[PDB]
Amino acid sequence: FSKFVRKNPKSDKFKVKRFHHIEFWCGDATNVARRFSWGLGMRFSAKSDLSTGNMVHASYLLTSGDLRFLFTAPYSPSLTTASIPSFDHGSCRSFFSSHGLGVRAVAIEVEDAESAFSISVANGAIPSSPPIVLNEAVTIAEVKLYGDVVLRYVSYKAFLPGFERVEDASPLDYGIRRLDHAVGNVPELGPALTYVAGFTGFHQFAEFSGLNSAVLASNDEMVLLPINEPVKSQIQTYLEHNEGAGLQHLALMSEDIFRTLREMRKRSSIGGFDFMPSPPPTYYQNLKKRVGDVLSDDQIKECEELGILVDRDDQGTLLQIFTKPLGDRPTIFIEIIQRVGCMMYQSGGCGGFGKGNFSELFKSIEEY
Amino acid sequence: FSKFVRKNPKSDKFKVKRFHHIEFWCGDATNVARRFSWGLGMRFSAKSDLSTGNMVHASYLLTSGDLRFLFTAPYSPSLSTTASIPSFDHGSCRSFFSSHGLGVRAVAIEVEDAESAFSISVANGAIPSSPPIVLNEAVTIAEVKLYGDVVLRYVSYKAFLPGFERVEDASFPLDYGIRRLDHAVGNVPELGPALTYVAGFTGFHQFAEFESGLNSAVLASNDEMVLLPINEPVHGKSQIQTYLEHNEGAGLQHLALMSEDIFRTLREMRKRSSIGGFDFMPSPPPTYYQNLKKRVGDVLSDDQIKECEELGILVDRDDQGTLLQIFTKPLGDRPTIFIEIIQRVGCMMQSGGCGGFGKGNFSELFKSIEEY
Ligand SMILES: Cc1ccccc1-n1c(=O)c2c(C)c(C(=O)C3=C(O)CCCC3=O)ccc2n(C)c1=O
Ligand SMILES: Cc1ccccc1-n1c(=O)c2c(C)c(C(=O)C3=C(O)CCCC3=O)ccc2n(C)c1=O
Ligand SMILES: [Co+2]
Ligand SMILES: [Co+2]
Structure with a gap:
């Protein structure tokens, strides 16, 4: 319990x-x-x-x-x-x-x-x-x-x-409807949280390698502003190529992530955006035991074909995937998410921000 | 005669x-x-x-x-x-x-x-x-x-x-059918010094041509495959002086891209103007294409002319061959450089400069707008 x-x-x-x-x-x-x-x-x-x-x-x-x-x-x-x-x-x-x-x-x-x-x-x-x-x-x-x-x-x-x-x-x-959160990269997370929360009054949104993270949310939890600091580390590579602090990625919410991912991957080689390499198949057969009560096996099958990551928290489930850098520098990229659950009209941050995928992506590689 | x-x-x-x-x-x-x-x-x-x-x-x-x-x-x-x-x-x-x-x-x-x-x-x-x-x-x-x-x-x-x-x-x-860059055109405040400079060190000759606000001249290599026209503004509004202002001086104005089939390419490009591609300049009046069967009806059938009117293609003709052409809108923010899509017909032995550069379409478009 x-x-x-x-x-x-x-x-x-x-x-x-x-x-x-x-x-x-x-x-x-x-x-x-x-x-x-x-x-x-x-x-x-x-x-x-x-x-x-x-x-x-x-x-x-x-x-x-x-x-x-x-x-x-x-x-x-x-x-x-x-x-x-x-x-x-x-x-x-x-x-x-x-x-x-x-x-x-x-x-x-x-x-x-x-x-x-x-x-x-x-x-x-x-x-x-x-x-x-x-x-x-x-x-x-x-x-x-x-x-x-x-x-x-x-x-x-x-x-x-x-x-x-x-x-x-x-x-x-392609189905994308609103901006969910905007994440930034800073050298020191402490002075950043002290600063931003100091003048906005935003509270810290609880959670659950190479980074330390914290999420500042508004009263309604619809404006989300996570920040990352480095601890190799992709956060540090961002700070080198951007030359200081900057926005890391824009998380974009869609009413259907399968519809969106189908449209965006068709266009990767003809002007669109490319994605990170997909997880091994052991990640997706270990899904029916992790999120078999939220997603059907067909929907699990759709994630395996589109390289979609799935993570779960105390109250919702988060489908997510990331693109490659948008321009020359390995800096700003885009995250496509769809939040499932938390219907009360839906609670912000439903499912989290995909922290559990660090352990789950690692775990699935040792098996494959 | x-x-x-x-x-x-x-x-x-x-x-x-x-x-x-x-x-x-x-x-x-x-x-x-x-x-x-x-x-x-x-x-x-x-x-x-x-x-x-x-x-x-x-x-x-x-x-x-x-x-x-x-x-x-x-x-x-x-x-570093x-x-x-x-x-x-x-x-x-x-x-x-x-x-x-x-x-x-x-x-x-x-x-x-x-x-x-x-x-x-x-x-x-x-x-x-x-x-x-x-x-x-x-x-x-x-x-x-x-x-x-x-x-x-x-x-x-x-x-x-x-x-x-x-x-x-x-x-796969x-x-879309584009095979080669035909010519690269630049804009300059004075055609005089630009010609004596470029043709002075290249040795390129003056490719003769067969109102608007420009004085043009085309330089060409011996085989006439490298074509480098240069344009100057004529004052007394001209799109070249407009170019010179926003380009902050001289610079390349447009590039002609030869296509093995201009209808294919235009259908594909126009398919994509609204979804990220390139937009094109407004099409000529319908009287422009009704005037085509007499100008160019000996090399183009009634359907290829019908395909020009649907795609918005300009047709010009010189002493050696014919030329089909169309122009895109400026590629970036400033109305500076644009792209030309051409296909030259005739002059087979294909000669460089077959059909000209469409300089007869300035008056031909004007002669087709002046239709009540
Ligand atoms: C995709 C990638 C490429 C090369 C290095 C790493 C990754 N990478 C991520 O960047 C990634 C991010 C950025 C999130 C994410 O959105 C998130 C953060 O973890 C920061 C806190 C707030 C937030 O929203 C979640 C999972 C991620 N996962 C699982 C992943 O592998
Ligand atoms: C003038 C103008 C304003 C707004 C949009 C379009 C136009 N516009 C052109 O730009 C245009 C060009 C650029 C050529 C052309 O290719 C050309 C020259 O004009 C100079 C000699 C070398 C050369 O290659 C031919 C016909 C043209 N025609 C008919 C036309 O209407
Ligand atoms: Co995110
Ligand atoms: Co031209």
Whole structure:
């Protein structure tokens, strides 16, 4: 008889709602956005460039359900008319030169961005962009998260001002619906948790080689922000190639992971994304004894064909798989997950974040 | 009652064979290469990156017949040489991409001897960019300046490049029919000094041609397989001056990719414009294709003209042959470099420059828009 007790102080210092968007910073946003669109199955739904009147930066929005990926690249400084107020030309090129293609801003929806900005800075956060109202409708603010990644606060009053809608009859959809969590890599986890939880009030989400991890969650546990430190270690290899702290991977949730994985693997060799090598077959015959009450044998058979990892915790089950690095550097990659269980409308973090797969993947290799 | 005479001095100062490859300079070569591979139907052939030992730059080679597109992005200098291409520089790559954006860096041509072609080039006025460097005692590379920040690269073998590994076929890989790069066109503020410079050290002759806002001129090798047109803006709006502003100076404007079948390729490319490929310029009016049976009805049937109207192909004709062509939208953020898809018909003995370069389609499109 085992029981796992979880505690949630709900110590959020301001009102946080949901993940808003993710802003990649590119050198040329057109080719990065068009490739992520075909590989992930995300629709071209908004733009802010020369064709809209923007002479400062080219920004393209891909949407799949609620998930929103923004791809921003700077124009020539000799051409303000920008839509993103915090965008500085020198920062973007310096960001790309030292880190490569990576995530710049992790945006979350708050009831009020300036209040969220004032409480954060008063609780240790280093500011990055002041609260700025746009067309008397949207307010944006940015604070330092880690390295050159910023935590962005978005608030409404009822995509963004300056963006034009894009409607086409393409329409790409592989099943992915929202962003589940965003993980970062830092040298020292202690000072990072002290910092981030210090100004957000996020509580630590309990759990259950080469890394130490901890998950900061919001009151509703829908905004999840894990952080990794190295202890060979893939975390250290990230810090070497990214040159300091940075976002490690974006965990993307889909309403069907089998539908998504089928679409993404078909396109791996024709512009999409490739995946890590699959587990040995002993991993998948040892599944009916581990998760035989949640997945049928056909569904176990579907994971074996698509290289899907399955792990279990105190209350749910997590199907997951990882892609290869998205760009040149062995840095940012994508995680595709589907959470099963915890229906009360579903609890955030249902099934965990796949820590148990480290022991289970190892265990299955000695048998094979 | 009419005839067009063409003179060929054959004044190449060194033996020029054929186009070798085109090197794009990117910020991230992985997302650009997988983009071009899907949109153009080119196969992953060779790589030179971290998985290969290279910690200075990442370079991926896409091939389609004999066409070769190289995409190079700089790694961080903190990973320190192991670079496969000796003329690479992290400072120049970041500076080139910051100044002009995604564009062509090197136009590589195959020659008899790169040590010979470099010495004669500089001796006849060319500005050097990379001395001839024998690599693995098997191939020689040298670079002289061409346009603004575009270099003319000489590739000569002794019997892709050493340092690369052949990428085994991942699948029946992608092939849309594109077989070869026809010509590479650049934009320049003054056609005068550009012609005297380039033709001054190459020895290339002026390939004569048989309103818009440009004055053009085509340089060609003796066999007329390496075609390098140069464009200048005509003022008094011009898409070249627009190019010069956003490109932050001179640079390569477009590349013509010859296809063994232009209808195949256009169907495949247009199939993918909405799903990550390349978009195309708006199609001509329906009166443009109703005017085709009299212009070009002796070489194209009523169905191939019907296939041009559906795919949006431009048809032009000169004294020697015919030309089918179509143009994509700019490949990157800035409206700078785009891609041309052509197929030349006739001039069989196929001659270089068969059908011309579509310069008769400026007035032909205008003559078909002016239809009530
Ligand atoms: C895929 C891979 C390649 C080369 C080195 C390692 C891996 N690798 C992972 O990176 C991996 C991750 C990143 C998670 C994961 O998502 C997760 C973390 O463990 C950090 C805490 C929060 C979180 O969400 C889970 C399982 C993983 N597993 C099982 C795996 O093997
Ligand atoms: C002008 C323009 C504006 C917006 C989109 C498309 C166009 N556009 C072209 O760019 C265009 C080109 C580029 C050629 C062409 O290939 C060419 C030259 O114009 C110069 C001589 C060497 C050469 O190769 C031929 C016809 C063209 N036509 C008919 C056209 O409409
Ligand atoms: Co994760
Ligand atoms: Co052309």
